[PDB]
Amino acid sequence: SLAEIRTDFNILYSMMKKHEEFRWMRLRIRRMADAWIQAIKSLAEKQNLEKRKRKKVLVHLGLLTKESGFKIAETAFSGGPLGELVQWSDLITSLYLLGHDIRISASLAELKEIMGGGGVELIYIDIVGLAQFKKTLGPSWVHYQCMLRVLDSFGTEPEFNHANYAQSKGHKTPWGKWNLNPQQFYTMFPHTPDNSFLGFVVEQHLNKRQNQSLVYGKVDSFWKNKKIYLDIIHTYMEVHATVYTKNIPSYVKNHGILSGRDLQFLLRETKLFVGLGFPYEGPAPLEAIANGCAFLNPKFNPPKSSKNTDFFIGKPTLRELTSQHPYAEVFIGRPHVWTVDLNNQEEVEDAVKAILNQKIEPYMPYEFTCEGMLQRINAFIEKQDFCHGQVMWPPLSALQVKLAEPGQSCKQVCQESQLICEPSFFQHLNKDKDMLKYKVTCQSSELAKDILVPSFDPKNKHCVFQGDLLLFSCAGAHPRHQRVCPCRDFIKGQVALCKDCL
Ligand SMILES: CC(=O)N[C@H]1[C@H](O[C@@H]2[C@@H](OC[C@H]3O[C@H](O)[C@@H](O)[C@@H](O[C@H]4O[C@H](CO)[C@@H](O)[C@H](O)[C@@H]4O)[C@@H]3O)O[C@H](CO)[C@@H](O)[C@@H]2O)O[C@H](CO)[C@@H](O)[C@@H]1O
Ligand SMILES: O=c1ccn([C@@H]2O[C@H](COP(=O)(O)OP(=O)(O)O)[C@@H](O)[C@H]2O)c(=O)[nH]1
Numbered sequence: 001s002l003a004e005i006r007t008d009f010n011i012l013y014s015m016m017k018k019h020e021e022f023r024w025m026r027l028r029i030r031r032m033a034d035a036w037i038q039a040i041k042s043l044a045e046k047q048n049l050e051k052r053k054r055k056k057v058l059v060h061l062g063l064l065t066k067e068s069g070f071k072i073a074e075t076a077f078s079g080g081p082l083g084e085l086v087q088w089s090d091l092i093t094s095l096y097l098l099g100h101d102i103r104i105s106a107s108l109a110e111l112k113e114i115m116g117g118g119g120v121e122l123i124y125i126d127i128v129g130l131a132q133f134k135k136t137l138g139p140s141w142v143h144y145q146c147m148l149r150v151l152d153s154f155g156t157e158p159e160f161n162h163a164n165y166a167q168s169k170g171h172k173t174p175w176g177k178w179n180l181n182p183q184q185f186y187t188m189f190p191h192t193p194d195n196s197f198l199g200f201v202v203e204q205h206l207n208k209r210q211n212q213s214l215v216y217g218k219v220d221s222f223w224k225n226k227k228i229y230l231d232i233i234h235t236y237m238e239v240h241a242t243v244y245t246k247n248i249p250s251y252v253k254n255h256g257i258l259s260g261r262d263l264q265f266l267l268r269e270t271k272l273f274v275g276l277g278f279p280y281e282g283p284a285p286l287e288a289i290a291n292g293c294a295f296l297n298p299k300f301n302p303p304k305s306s307k308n309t310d311f312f313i314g315k316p317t318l319r320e321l322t323s324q325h326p327y328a329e330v331f332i333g334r335p336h337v338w339t340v341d342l343n344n345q346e347e348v349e350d351a352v353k354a355i356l357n358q359k360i361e362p363y364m365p366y367e368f369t370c371e372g373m374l375q376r377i378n379a380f381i382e383k384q385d386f387c388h389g390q391v392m393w394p395p396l397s398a399l400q401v402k403l404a405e406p407g408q409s410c411k412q413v414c415q416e417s418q419l420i421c422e423p424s425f426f427q428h429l430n431k432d433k434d435m436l437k438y439k440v441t442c443q444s445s446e447l448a449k450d451i452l453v454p455s456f457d458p459k460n461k462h463c464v465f466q467g468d469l470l471l472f473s474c475a476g477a478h479p480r481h482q483r484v485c486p487c488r489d490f491i492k493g494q495v496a497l498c499k500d501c502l
Contacts, residue, residue: 022064057124060105089200162179217279299341444463
């Protein structure tokens with residue numbers, strides 16, 4: 001019953017051959033196999049990985065079911081979306097290497113069969129698959145609720161997750177209203193502290209034409225109305241493309257869709273990877289940076305959200321994007337990432353001229369390496385418990401309380417102290433007695449069911465405490481009062497984990 005690290009992919013390869021729909025994912029795993037095996041052994045030398053119970057794990061890929069009508073496997077090789085497939089590939093690989101008993105499903109039959117057999121201890125699924133899970137199992141689906149880890153790339157804010165509160169605000173999201181512990185949502189980037197950061201691994205194969213730029217956007221429509229911007233870059237640089245077509249100027253050198261090996265070799269010799277503004281928060285820019293390319297990161301002033309961007313309407317968040325790649329912007333920055341308004345011609349020109357004159361190294365944040373990802377997911381599996389069975393994680397010792405000023409969210413105030421909001425600690429900040437510990441003195445108080453509390457008015461020393469524990473929210477600014485915010489430290493380059501969380 002104890003987990004043994006796997007260093008051989010033969011069983012994973014047989015598992016991935018059962019469905020055609022896993023083909024793209026199988027090629028990625030085979031290209032990164034050596035780096036994966038190097039990282040599980042390396043992690044095992046740094047950390048006792050013994051004494052872990054082997055878990056029976058459901059991995060249900062809703063996006064690859066017919067019934068979903070997503071047809072994501074059918075566009076994998078022709079410029080279709082791959083970020084979800086990137087993340088699913090790396091999640092499956094990590095579970096496999098860490099020695100767990102994985103049962104993969106891309107169908108209602110396998111979902112039913114695997115659950116039928118019992119002993120499932122852990123469930124990875126997407127929101128489309130979660131609807132299927134509830135429908136296939138019936139009312140006893142809720143018995144398995146605390147085991148769900150829900151891969152939700154853009155994240156779910158608590159106001160969208162609480163079904164009744166969401167209705168009361170007129171949130172029509174088809175993605176929300178699941179009433180989970182919002183830490184059960186697993187995001188693509190660490191942009192939503194209400195959720196967990198799952199991420200993925202940035203592919204790279206290193207052991208450069210200074211003039212060569214490569215445009216981000218493997219679909220022609222993404223290039224709509226970028227002619228002036230591309231012209232600026234073309235004044236200094238060749239402009240290449242990987243596009244599967246009358247938006248793409250005449251001077252653009254289109255290589256077509258490249259297989260990962262060949263795309264990775266084009267990144268190796270490219271000086272500048274160029275963002276057009278779409279798509280949002282994908283892997284491709286981190287691949288460019290891992291290959292020593294600068295990334296030109298379109299800045300959004302004002303920031304993009306459901307308030308002003310059609311793509312975001314219906315998504316279970318009000319999160320504002322400051323750039324095409326806010327993670328690249330804030331967690332990498334210069335010299336690797338240049339965040340520029342495509343409007344300000346000077347800004348764009350100076351960025352290109354500087355990029356030409358820079359000498360930069362390949363860079364990967366630790367959390368996006370094989371070993372980083374294995375450490376993050378191993379800590380989640382061993383320590384993250386919503387089934388009340390284990391000791392408190394993260395541990396109470398990690399709690400740092402900060403007061404958010406009016407118009408500042410808990411996300412922002414934790415971040416401004418190089419901490420991260422830790423929603424599992426809201427429970428320790430929610431009554432008169434507890435606030436004394438954190439030098440807030442409540443002259444009066446009341447309860448409220450609001451995402452903005454616990455709140456404190458320092459003028460009349462009045463405390464509002466949370467009436468509905470499902471509405472605890474790192475997201476959200478009080479326009480008038482201070483918020484009492486739970487923060488935590490993180491391991492350097494590993495924001496998912498507190499220093500005492502391993
Ligand atoms: C897989 C998944 O659920 N990903 C996240 C999701 O992202 C959305 C999802 O869209 C799935 C497909 O949904 C419909 O079938 C279409 O909108 C597809 O787009 C294609 O066809 C459209 C017309 O039918 C066309 O408008 C469009 O240009 C495209 O060619 C979608 O593929 O996944 C895609 C791809 O990344 C994404 O763009 C969608 O936003 O959002 C969820 C909520 O944020 C999140 O939980 C989930 O991880
Ligand atoms: O010609 C190409 C261009 C991109 N990619 C891959 O497409 C993946 C997804 O990158 P992107 O940021 O475009 O995410 P998406 O929008 O596809 O989810 C990355 O791993 C790239 O390596 C590819 O295989 N061939």
